Design a protein around this nucleic acid. Sequence first.
DNA 1: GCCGCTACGTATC
Lengths: 117, 14, 14, 257, 257
Amino acid sequence: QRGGCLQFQNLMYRGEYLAGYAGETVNLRFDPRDITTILVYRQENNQEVFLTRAHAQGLETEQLALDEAEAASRRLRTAGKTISNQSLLQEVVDRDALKERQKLEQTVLRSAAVDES
Amino acid sequence: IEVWDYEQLREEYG
Amino acid sequence: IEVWDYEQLREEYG
Amino acid sequence: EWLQAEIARLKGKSIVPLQQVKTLHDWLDGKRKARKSCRVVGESRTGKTVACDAYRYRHKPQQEAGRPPTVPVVYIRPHQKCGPKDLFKKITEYLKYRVTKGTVSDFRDRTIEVLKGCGVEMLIIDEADRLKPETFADVRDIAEDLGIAVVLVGTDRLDAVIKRDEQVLERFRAHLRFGKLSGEDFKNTVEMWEQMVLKLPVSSNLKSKEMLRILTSATEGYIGRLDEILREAAIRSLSRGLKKIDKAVLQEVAKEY
Amino acid sequence: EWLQAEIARLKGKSIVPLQQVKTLHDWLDGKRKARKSCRVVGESRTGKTVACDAYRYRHKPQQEAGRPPTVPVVYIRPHQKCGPKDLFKKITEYLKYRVTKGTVSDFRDRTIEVLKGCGVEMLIIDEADRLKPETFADVRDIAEDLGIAVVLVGTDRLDAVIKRDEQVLERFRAHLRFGKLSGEDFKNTVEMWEQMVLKLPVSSNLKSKEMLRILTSATEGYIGRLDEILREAAIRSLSRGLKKIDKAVLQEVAKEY
DNA sequence: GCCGCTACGTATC
Ligand SMILES: Nc1ncnc2c1ncn2[C@@H]1O[C@H](COP(=O)(O)OP(=O)(O)OP(=O)(O)O)[C@@H](O)[C@H]1O
Ligand SMILES: Nc1ncnc2c1ncn2[C@@H]1O[C@H](COP(=O)(O)OP(=O)(O)OP(=O)(O)O)[C@@H](O)[C@H]1O
Ligand SMILES: [Mg+2]
């Protein structure tokens, strides 16, 4: 979009050269464990070329997994509130802080992934 | 069609 | 910028 | 100052001839001529009190030289936990008599005298559910004994209160219900505010589909929200200097609801 | 003693300009001109009271001649299970009149007289949910009878009480909401506590990432915890003799939660 | 009239 912007999963992203390519099409490579950052590739000479590391504006200090942004978006849709990077983070941090078996499972699974680091 | 000021109705009253 | 002491606002208030 | 004159005007109030007011007056004339007691009910922003003030301010008191006034219609509004004395106190004051200290039966006797003296045909009690349960004995008595049509105005809680006394329920059985605007009727009414109430220097075209979606979701069909949303949007947009209401400025006011 | 002078500064209180306080004062100026009732909602440590007090300290009583004070904005706070006489009594005292023995109708008639003449435009009721359910009849009555905007301030529980009556829920719909600090807004606010409220001998640099992690987990974005954590840390720091806050001393204070 | 985000239908482990 004009203003060097990309929309994904309600999240809005800004990139270091991306305003040069408003109106163009880009292939976005992302990690479901951390969607705060998106790698942007574009077609040129019928090959992908790397462009830039776009970042969710105002979340550069913050980490969202895809299933959290998705659960926050579902809750946000049904809560009737507006779409924005923080608004989605706000709909995460209360459900984070406040349990449900999937979140309890995810905590033990996380503790194993921590021991992998 | 006629519309009334609520204060004119008060001023016109008994 | 000015930052107000809360007890001062009470002392100055009418 | 042309702006400040419109801000002083728009924060005011008006009465508009609408179908749900014309309907009430045709009905209340029927009850007044026939002397039949009844109730008017419906959700809290339908404008029942404005529809009853438009009735009280028609049918003006008649004056005859040195007689007490002939008063066809009385509208009173009780305070909370209204007792028998408070009802009688207010009816006496409304007919322009000062109430002197006495026992409940002195207030009862004087009230019956002034109702019969001023030739009252109809008594309208707003917010009827502020009445204490025993006072309805005195309201039934006024209606049994004098040729007076008592009209109770309230909302759906009034029925929850009337249904706790068989004597009131079987007397106040005839009723008219105030309803919400929809379809063509909400559409047509928005044009009446634009051209008869708001008085903005250029047409805001509030009845257009892109604007009716905004106004429908804001108002739910309540006439008491429609007047409130459209006065607040007019006050606000004039303080920014526009000659209209437009999509974004109306969505600013509606986002407060 | 230079240390004693500064310890007496930290245990005190102050009002800092912030975006939420500034938003509310713009919004309440819109409501005070429009004469439109509304309510302010939000979580219990967001600073709704300090934001309303800063609005009571604007719009000061204009004294003249031997007339009663002209008070544009009245702010009261009710006692628990507040009745109809308790509300009038506080309104009458805040306007600087003495209340004497009488009955309910007298407090009411007298309240309306002091609200007239003396120039009230807005009434702000804090902790609105201390009101007994019937008193809302008197709150609505004033708002409708006199050109006075009434503002109800409170927590989410207030709305749970309000939804228990349509008549009230519709006069007071418009609602501004107070939220929690996050992202850049929490970080920027931490610098204001350092450079305008604390003013420590040398700078603690609380905007640094490790101090922000400690503060974020401690405060959860509540301005009523940021004001509390940093005074507790700065008092400890100074009374132990430190020229600033540091990682371990702030973790000692935050571990109390 | 054109375009990122939701929602429903179908298939398989
Ligand atoms: N016919 C009308 N013409 C103009 N304005 C109207 C009309 N009806 C209602 N309004 C406006 O909408 C508001 C409706 O409030 P109103 O008191 O009439 O409703 P209500 O049914 O009496 O409320 P409640 O039942 O809770 O007492 C009024 O304040 C007025 O500004
Ligand atoms: N602008 C400000 N400057 C300084 N301190 C502030 C400011 N705003 C809020 N505070 C602090 O926030 C703390 C919370 O108290 P406050 O009453 O403001 O919260 P509250 O939301 O009103 O509480 P409650 O909801 O229970 O009434 C207080 O210690 C107050 O000093
Ligand atoms: Mg009414």
